[PDB]
Design a protein around this ligand. Structure first.
Ligand SMILES: NCCC[C@H](N)C(=O)O
Ligand SMILES: NCCC[C@H](N)C(=O)O
Ligand SMILES: NCCC[C@H](N)C(=O)O
Ligand SMILES: NCCC[C@H](N)C(=O)O
Ligand SMILES: [Mn+2]
Ligand SMILES: [Mn+2]
Ligand SMILES: [Mn+2]
Ligand SMILES: [Mn+2]
Ligand SMILES: [Mn+2]
Ligand SMILES: [Mn+2]
Ligand SMILES: [Mn+2]
Ligand SMILES: [Mn+2]
Ligand SMILES: [Mn+2]
Ligand SMILES: [Mn+2]
Ligand SMILES: [Mn+2]
Ligand SMILES: [Mn+2]
Lengths: 319, 320, 318, 318, 317, 320
């Protein structure tokens, strides 16, 4: 295949994909602005990327399933603390980055990660939209947080729910591994505090990463003692805001079977809500990652789990 | 099509044959307890296999027989947590099932069907020492059951209600008998003084007005730790006719009870309900276990086992 | 107390039979007022699973089948064009309350008798004809006995099964679900017995097939037997044809929701090819051994059993 | 605001069509530079499920099908020897972003028109030919409409389905997945419509079959029809042949992952024998109604649907 | 070093002595009963690590044995043989693949252990080896042992969705996608009759042609049916070997396999061919049952057990 | 009518071959650890694939190979929660499976088979510094295992026992070796001083007497919250030969461990076992993980991972 046909087409296809996101973001931004009475609106951007996974790539299929579950007929549209999701200023959908089609053009991982970052900035460029990213595997948090921090001009504090620290300097030769985005984030200087919750699978090399970057890694084996800390968090003060990343496998596999990495002895769903509902600070973006529909039960319980996490994060981020 | 005159006569005769069946089963079990002595109250299972007042899935219509079988699953023994023997008929007994499907198939309307459920409950209460423990079925059945208990005893009860949902909608999709409204109906009839709800985590702002309008004590999951010592030391019924306990299986976390229509993540642990139930003080005069849905259960029927244990433990507290 | 026990048994059983009688009276009067009907397939549930040798979940089948007949994903027309919304094509009578009756301490002979009387109550109301929903396969004996007594003679039987169900003595249970057709042949209630789908048969039951002149069609010769099976003509010279369909005659890939999986079974289309072409006066039938507790989450075997009922009803109603 | 809302819909629809156009242009230029190709089956996903009558899960199918085409448990050669690693044999264009356009308030007529124009954008790039991935079966109408209009005449259609999909009015939805071939026959976009697998059909739709000269082959005559259906010759005298493959044409034991289980369907080899021997200039086709939300944990129906795509593409590419 | 290999050798010899004593037992039992010329003897090879997608067939042998002699399934084969008669079928045991692997033993030596285990069975007249896989790679060391022990070639009847004839599959000489390449290269087979084939690359079609393999594809099954249901194999060589890959069956009937290939054989297709096969059957195998991909009810274990029961009836005499 | 001289000869020779296999494997691993140095105890896995003493389902016979595979699942890493590296043979190693099926097929009775299991455990203990961590198999195997550990060490042990059931039935269905009686056999033999049970939620009144008779310390789920400070600070083994840890997988709630034979709702969370086991003080001399039933697990094999993690965390506490 010729080099010119490749270089040009890649840019044409990528330009078209970004234009679609830009038009959708303009549509929703204009809508919120014509409604008034809104300071921030959680805006869903799907990033259906699985190929940085180390075991199973099914989370690539997650974003459309999460969006549907948000409106399951078995549920109502009010959040636990009383916000109405039927209000467009509380939550709106922007769209999905077309990862598979862009990848199919022969685009490399660096450029792909750059398209993700540009898509996040398109959303942030429309006041009052704030990005709530649907994964996809956890690799997407690096290009998302990089974009948020670049757009805001400074660091954020990060609340990170995970069974895994995701701080590998080098996982299997993949800079963009879903096991490394937070090493990428701390290397770039995009985060101040990194508060990790649910950790129960961590190697000794990564324990040195935690020490090196001043990460606040809360392990399940101390959760009873750490609970008053985690349920009283005040992040962001002094920097540009707070970013909340929620890996669905932070929950016990009994609660969230639909994930690639089962790690028994995880969080209860009410643990995450307690922490998230009590969190103080200016949330400027977030993600819900690693829901894997291909490993879910036939009743789609993990789609509902992921949807409720999105609903409760949106209630905290919209203003 | 068919003569409405033919329908009305069929409806009366079929309803009368169904009530006569329940009466003879109740009279049977009544005479059996009274011949055994040493019994002041016997929890008596009445199935109400009704699902068509559900808003999402009707599979709980099939629950009551699956619950009764799980009470005697072969992987389990017959003793309750605090030592009561389920092989003792005075501890627990089965009356039977209201044949909802066949009555509905006569063209009976929803008001009449609710009246059949109420009359079935009164047939049970008529036989000393039986007390009704109702197996749903969706939660709409708590209205005609609680109405019956209250009418038969001649006064209000206090209600302990385990649920993810307050079930207090004034008007849910135009169905007065919606499973999302039975406690709005109960409060409108004044059948309950106190209504203590536990497990709540899905509530609309309109329904919050209902809670304050009727003085309901609605305990939400986000305050359960703060509320725990109150709830594990409950004392109900004093001054009125007794205590009624309604257990919605979806009050439990979906990881523990997947066999329900309405999955709501972040629910009660099975031990949460037992702590409250086993510690509850007051004269339990009836109760129900509702919304188990076999069609959404795991292949090994884990939620049937869950629902049976709830029935087992409520019976231990009601029988004496 | 022995007197309290007989009297309660009499009175519970009587009230149960009155319920069935009143339901059948209603549906008979309904069809007779509609007119233009010689026979209406009428569903009688027999939720009995305790004569099973492995798993008793088919006790729960009858209500699941009735629901799947009207599943929202299907339409109400049979493959050859009958409309199930026509009450003359199919109607529900009710379920015998087996659990409540057995809970009165009634023994198995009296239980079998209550099933027989319930069937006869359906047949008493022109033009209803009984289509029984099991329940395990033991119920076929009291049902066929009732049909044959009420009609005054023998019937021919078309019987779909993976197993002959012809054991003289299965683990000491006379009413075992693996013995009902031995009981039927012993009583002379049936003349011809044509079994289709057999792939699990002991050498001891092979001598029961010789003894009674059963026509046993085994899977291994299905291909050669296909012209005969797709042109069956039963009942001529006797009182009619009774069709018993054991759901586990179907391959487990099609019907996972059964107690006894036997690989290499019938395809669903094999049963329909035989049933839709069957000539003869069908006077009753049954669909048994659907076990909801062994079905898949989608309930495919409920739909399978419902479609067997729908297609049997299309042939029995006229 | 209406006039503003319309301008926003227009810009969003335009950006979506531009994305499909650049993807088709890209793949078109790739095939032409490779040479030695007359037709390349080109996958266009239409993730639409909201015209379904029972379950909308087939909205999620296209990306699962594409992944299964390259499952690590399979190899990349089709049964008759074509290599899927050759971009000339199969290639992906993209998915119409149905959800995001619907979310602008676009109504169903405009949505169908966007589908039609997307198909035309593929056909505009020689030598791409559209192989559409549903989505529910409603998409076949705007797809066949676009194929017929672009080619300038009628096509003959080979249609695998449990259901005729010929309802004049299914529940008030003109775009119902139970009516696309009514819409196709009304518009004159097809000459012959040859349906295979039919086993769920109402009497009003039997009248539709007669009214449009539809050749509806029901399962109850499959063995008799087999020499006809396995030597089909379509499209001569018209603009070509279009193949619509509804996955629920297969028995649910083979394809559980569909919204409408209908027991007694085709075996997979039945479809292959017909499709592999089909003669005629295939100008387009689709594979519809795979529902991953009702599939088994192993995703067998995704593999079933992928193999149908793979074999259809073997016949269409040349 | 040189010490390491002596330590592995003690583990291997202990494993082979276990097999030898079990075969010794069953061999003595048949000879004392009398009235028997051949007894199908089950040898498990719980090996899954030469699989290209999923290794779960490593757990198959004990699941299959349980389904042969289990509950709610009678004990007579289709054409009438008594499975409670030890002369019709008997269990020898399982090669302890996992423990030998855990000693650092390489794949060539592991395959040698498999061959020698087969030969210990053949040594105890009248037992004949019926091997339970495990993935299909085990057919190579098994057939090599059968042929070496009999001193000549065998004709092979092979049921499979896949020809398993890759000369080189992903650089693994012992790949489960290559055992019949290894068999043909080794000169252990004369005829190779393959049935059920519906997944074959053009490179492998060249292998088929080069070795004169008789590869019957599903797309021509109907017209091949007369030839296939009157097979006569083994005349002039040392006997017939029957290899049954469970994924030859349609995945609707046999979902418990690693490689789902839609459009497979019906259960009756295999049994018609197998039961009408003429020729002296000297060994066989049933491979690629994967319990970790079976239904919760284990229907494929039942499928695999029935295949084993019908092969045993044909091999025992 | 099968010659007994032939059977008995097969029994002795097959059992000898089987024990010689375990001996050589133990010698292989023991030599390896001695050549590596810096080790005082290495947890060594011994499988006992026995399910025929189960009262409901025998599927746990298939567990040991599944558990070992899940210890190295590609989705996990090889570091335990508190930092030990399973890739280090001194931390965990495999010995092998007792071939229960092949020995039974020789006509060996249940006493002789329990004896084979005991001698296999002693074969592991002979090789310094291996310590037995037994993979079941149903819970009947704990009796011959603890018998062997006690005899080899010459005295009693204290036991930490995780279970939904006390397993203390004197006579369960006429089977002396029932999986519901191994701790009655242990206590009759005097191989245990203290028996601390955790997770108990299914206990009959008869067995309540058994607990009294042997001084068992039976902590029921009913009191878990009060008992948590005691159970998460356990000091066992002082004054005797060591501590044996028996983990029955059905101690965990069925929502976590569906792949067991006996589902009993309201059980332990996985974090409950870890909190107790990671904080346990005492010289652990052996352990087992029993009753994982792969045939009742979900298709993702979650209970295999659950069991594997329990083995991984027990090995971390036993190896040193
Ligand atoms: N009984 C359950 C009612 C559920 C309903 N979605 C609600 O809004 O509560
Ligand atoms: N994001 C999940 C990474 C999982 C990997 N096995 C690890 O060792 O962390
Ligand atoms: N495309 C499927 C339509 C199904 C509908 N129940 C019918 O009667 O055709
Ligand atoms: N034994 C299975 C081999 C499967 C392989 N993907 C093939 O190309 O045949
Ligand atoms: Mn993670
Ligand atoms: Mn993560
Ligand atoms: Mn409720
Ligand atoms: Mn509720
Ligand atoms: Mn049968
Ligand atoms: Mn039968
Ligand atoms: Mn269709
Ligand atoms: Mn269809
Ligand atoms: Mn193979
Ligand atoms: Mn194969
Ligand atoms: Mn236990
Ligand atoms: Mn135990």
């Amino acid at each position: 295949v010729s080099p010119a046909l490749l270089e040009k087409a890649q840019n044409r296809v990528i330009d078209a994909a970004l234009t679609f996101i830009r038009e959708r973001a303009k549509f929703k931004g204009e809508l919120m602005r014509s409604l008034g009475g809104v300071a921030a609106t959680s805006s869903l951007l799907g990033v259906p990327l699985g190929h940085h996974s180390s075991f199973h790539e099914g989370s690539a299929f997650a974003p459309p399933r999460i969006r549907e579950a948000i409106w399951c007929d078995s549920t109502n549209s009010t959040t636990e603390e009383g916000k109405n999701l039927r209000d467009p200023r509380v939550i709106t959908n922007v769209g999905d980055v077309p990862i598979e089609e862009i990848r199919d053009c022969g685009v490399d991982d660096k450029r792909l990660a750059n398209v993700i970052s540009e898509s996040v900035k398109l959303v942030m460029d429309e006041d009052p939209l704030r990005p709530l990213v649907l994964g996809g595997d956890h690799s997407i948090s690096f290009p998302v947080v990089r974009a948020v921090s670049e757009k805001l001009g400074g660091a954020v504090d990060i609340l990170h729910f995970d069974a895994h620290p995701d701080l590998y300097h080098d996982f299997e030769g993949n800079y963009y591994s879903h096991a490394s985005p937070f090493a990428r984030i701390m290397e770039g200087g995009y985060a101040r505090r990194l508060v990790q919750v649910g950790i129960r699978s961590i190697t000794n090399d990564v324990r040195e990463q935690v020490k090196k970057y001043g990460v606040e890694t809360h392990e399940m084996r101390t959760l009873s003692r750490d609970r008053p800390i985690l349920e009283n968090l005040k992040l962001g003060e002094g920097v540009k805001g707070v970013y909340v990343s929620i890996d669905v496998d932070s929950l016990d596999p009994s609660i969230a079977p639909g994930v690639s990495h089962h790690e028994p002895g995880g969080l209860l769903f009410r643990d995450i809500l307690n922490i998230l509902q009590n969190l103080q600070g200016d949330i400027v973006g977030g993600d819900v990652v690693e829901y894997n529909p291909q490993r879910d039960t036939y009743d789609g319980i993990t789609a509902l789990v992921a949807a409720k996490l999105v609903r409760e994060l949106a209630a905290k981020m919209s203003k």
